[PDB]
Amino acid sequence: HKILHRLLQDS
Amino acid sequence: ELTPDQATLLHFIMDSYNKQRMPQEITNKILKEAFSAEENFLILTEMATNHVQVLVEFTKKLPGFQTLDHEDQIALLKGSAVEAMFLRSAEIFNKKLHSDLLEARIRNSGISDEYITPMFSFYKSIGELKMTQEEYALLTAIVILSPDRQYIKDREAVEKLQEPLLDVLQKLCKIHQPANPQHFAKLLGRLTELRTFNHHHAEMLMSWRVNHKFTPLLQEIWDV
Ligand SMILES: O=c1[nH]c(-c2ccc(N3[C@@H]4CC[C@H]3C[C@@H](OCc3c(-c5c(Cl)cccc5Cl)noc3C3CC3)C4)cc2F)no1
16 A cells, blocks of 8 residues: 555645 | 534535546547447546546545544545545536446446446436535545544544534535435435445456456555
C-alpha cells in the first residue's frame, strides 16, 4: 500500500 | 434549520466533490473505441484507476481525515473505494443528459451475469430516489468515514468524523423533502446495500483475474 500513502499528503 | 457551520461544511465538501473531472482522452474513448470485450475491460480499468486518483484527492480533503492513524486511515480507503465507485457511477447513470454507451461496455466486458443483475438493480434503485448532487457528495463522504470498517483500531475516533456529516445530511432530508420522511431512511439503506456489493466484489475480480492485467494502484486497493 505504497501509492495510496504516496498519493496522500501531497501539496 | 441549518447552521452556518454546517453550511460551510456542506460548501467545502461540494466544491471538493464537484472538482472531479473525467479526463478528456478517457471519456471520448468510450464512444470512439471498439466494443470488444478486451477493449471494454481496458477502458473500464482506466476509468477505475483514474477515479481512485480522484477519490484519494477528495478524501484527503475531508476535514479531519489526515488526523488519524496511518494504518487505519489507509484501511478506510481499502474498504470504501468500491462503494464510492458504485455511488459515483450510479450518479452518472441516473444523470439526465454517454451513460448508455458505458453501460453497454460494462455489460460486455467479461463480467459474470451473477454480478450484472445486482449492479443495475442497484443503479435503478438509486435512480428512483432522485438524489441531489448534495446527497451524492455527502453520501460519498459518509461512506468513506465508516466506524465499523474492518481492520480498524480507533473506531470511536472515526465516529467523531462521520456523525457531523450524517447530521448535515439528515437536516437536508428534513429541509428539502418534508413531503417524504422516509427519504433519509432510504438514503441510509443504500449504504447497507453497498456493503453487499463491496464484499462480493473480490469474487467479481476473481473471475476477471482467472482469465488479465490490473494497474498497480488498482492492485494496491483490491488486494490482487
Ligand atoms: O466526471 C466524471 N466521472 C465519471 C465516472 C466516474 C466513475 C465511473 N465508474 C466507472 C469507473 C469507476 C466507476 C465505477 C466503475 O468502475 C469500473 C470497474 C469496477 C466497478 C464496476 Cl464495473 C461497478 C461498480 C463499481 C466498480 Cl469499482 N470494477 O472494476 C472496474 C474496472 C477494472 C475494470 C465504472 C464512470 C464514470 F464515467 N464520468 O465523468
